[PDB]
Design a protein around this ligand. Structure first.
Ligand SMILES: COc1ccc(Oc2c(Cl)cc(CO)cc2Cl)cc1C(C)C
Length: 253
């Protein structure tokens, strides 16, 4: 099943779905690299309360996750899976896709990330009280930056992050296995055609994205135990559904 012509069509389809669902174009991010937060603006972020900084980060992640949902809806074969499996895949993989997409907003030259209109280092997030998780995220983005991914490679790699037939709870595991296998062929065919197969051994182990997502859920539990009413009243509903139904509504639209 699936011939060479069909594999190449899938490559172009995934790349197109990714381009249409990017929050900001790569060119926009690269053109902002000299726009760095001043020492006074960094101090301002560090002086914010922990709950206000958490709310700002949860809002930005929720917006990023909305683009990932749209990417999934446009992904060939995803809407053909049952709704149980669409929700299982998105609950487990949406944050993983956001964390990979984040390398596009990361500048390896000065270790800064584009956040709220300017580039800032890890120290910008000190008020969160989760230095280990923030350090891990920056290290992860640095590791991806070292691969020099093209937009097409991020599109194919993120499609595989999402279409993972090993997620617990899948009712139609074989159908997800088939889609995953076609996407693996599409990704490996593209790498082979562009002489980029050397990146396969340099991609992060699957346990790496899993540990970042588990650390996020653990830090959110600590924060929610200290500020339960802040989470109830001021965190985005989609964020609480995934990490603490909206997903079903987004998938129906
Ligand atoms: C996975 O958890 C994350 C992920 C990111 C995060 O903070 C960031 C946000 Cl919202 C945006 C950018 C630039 O796009 C970079 C970082 Cl480090 C905080 C958390 C926790 C504290 C909610």
């Amino acid at each position: 099943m699936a011939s060479l012509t069909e594999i190449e069509h899938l490559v172009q389809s995934v790349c197109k779905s990714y381009r249409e669902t990017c929050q900001l174009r790569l060119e926009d991010l690269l053109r902002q690299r000299s726009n760095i937060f001043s020492r006074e603006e960094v101090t301002g972020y560090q002086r914010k309360s922990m709950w206000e900084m958490w709310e700002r980060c949860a809002h930005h992640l929720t917006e990023a996750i909305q683009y990932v949902v749209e990417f999934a809806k446009r992904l060939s074969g995803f809407m053909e899976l049952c709704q149980n499996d669409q929700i299982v895949l998105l609950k487990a993989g949406a944050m993983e896709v956001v964390l990979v997409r984040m390398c596009r907003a990361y500048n390896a030259d000065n270790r800064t990330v584009f956040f709220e209109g300017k580039y800032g280092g890890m120290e910008l997030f000190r008020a969160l009280g989760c230095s280990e998780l923030i350090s891990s995220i920056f290290d992860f983005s640095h590791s991806l930056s070292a691969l020099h991914f093209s937009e097409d490679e991020i599109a194919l790699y993120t499609a595989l992050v999402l279409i993972n037939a090993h997620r617990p709870g899948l009712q139609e595991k074989r159908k997800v296995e088939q889609l995953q296998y076609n996407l693996e062929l599409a990704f490996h065919h593209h790498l082979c055609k562009t002489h980029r197969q050397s990146i396969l051994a340099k991609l992060p182990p699957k346990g790496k994205l899993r540990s970042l997502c588990s650390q996020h859920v653990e830090r959110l539990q600590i924060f929610q135990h200290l500020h339960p009413i802040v989470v109830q009243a001021a965190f985005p509903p989609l964020y609480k559904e995934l990490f603490s139904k909206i997903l079903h509504r987004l998938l129906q639209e």
